[PDB]
């Protein structure tokens, strides 16, 4: 049957919030809730070739701070910091010139075990007419070789352009979805194929969190150094 969202079930217990701010009134709460959505959607739908794993937003009465974790931040940086100013102006237009922007790019360590970029690669391969069995097999084998626990990939839709929708699942390793202690990262993406839309959902297991607390700690960004700038 239907299952609750893996991220939503674990939020507020073993996962911190992607946007951390306290608005003044109900009128401002909607504007701030929509502007952050616009910024995140921008960073995800465009500038996709940089493998942006996640973007967090942190706002005060008047100051906006953006933390963009990316696997290949060279594409965000551009040639001698060219596209950086373009995305800065895009964000400033999105929120407002009256505020102070503190954009900060962060190179994410051990990218392979991140469901967002795994799903994005899956969707890109699907859209590029790559055969599905080979695509999922190579993604699963590279994810496992990255040194993580089980990964479950569900790819549904008009499969290979067929007129009857199917679904194909590959679980390889233990994926306890009912357990709350487990560190399960879940992402979902849409491959826009010439025959319609394909939905790819990737669950990845990254061990068990044996330290009680609302995170306040990096999650698989720490194995190598996670120090990139563009801030003040």
């Amino acid at each position: 049957g239907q299952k609750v969202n893996s991220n939503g079930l674990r939020f507020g217990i073993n996962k911190n919030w992607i946007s951390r701010w306290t608005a003044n009134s109900h009128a401002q709460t909607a504007k701030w809730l929509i502007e952050d959505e616009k910024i995140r959607n921008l960073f995800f739908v465009n500038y996709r070739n940089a493998q942006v794993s996640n973007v967090e937003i942190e706002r005060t009465q008047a100051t906006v701070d953006v933390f963009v974790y990316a696997a290949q931040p060279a594409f965000l940086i551009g040639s001698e910091n060219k596209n950086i100013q373009k995305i800065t102006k895009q964000i400033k237009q999105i929120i407002g010139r009256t505020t102070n922007l503190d954009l900060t790019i962060n190179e994410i360590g051990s990218p392979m075990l991140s469901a967002r970029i795994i799903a994005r690669d899956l969707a890109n391969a699907i859209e590029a007419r790559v055969p599905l069995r080979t695509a999922m097999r190579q993604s699963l084998i590279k994810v496992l070789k990255a040194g993580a626990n089980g990964i479950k990939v569900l790819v549904s839709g008009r499969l290979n352009g067929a007129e009857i929708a199917r679904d194909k699942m590959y679980i390889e390793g233990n994926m306890p979805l009912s357990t709350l202690r487990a560190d399960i990262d879940y992402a979902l993406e849409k491959a826009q194929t010439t025959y319609g839309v394909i939905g790819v959902k990737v669950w990845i297991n990254r061990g068990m969190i044996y330290t009680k607390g609302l995170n306040r700690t990096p999650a698989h960004i720490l194995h190598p150094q996670k120090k990139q700038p563009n801030r003040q």
């Binding site: 939020f11 996962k15 919030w17 909607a30 959505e37």
Partner: protein
């Protein structure tokens, strides 16, 4: 007809009671949360994505 209705909602009317609250992300008119300015079906998505700070699932 949805784009015209969204634009008309943003535009101020000539009477005060003419004004209604639509969702800001989507354009749904009914079942809009004035605390968040977002309809129920987009509030669920934002809460499951972690966008709204402090909105955790309730156990009572």
């Amino acid at each position: 007809a949805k784009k015209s209705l969204k634009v008309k909602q943003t535009r101020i009317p000539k009477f005060a009671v003419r004004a209604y609250t639509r969702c800001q992300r989507c354009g749904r008119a009914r079942a809009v949360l004035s605390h968040f300015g977002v309809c129920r079906l987009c509030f669920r998505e934002l809460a499951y994505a972690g966008a709204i700070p402090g909105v955790k699932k309730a156990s009572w």
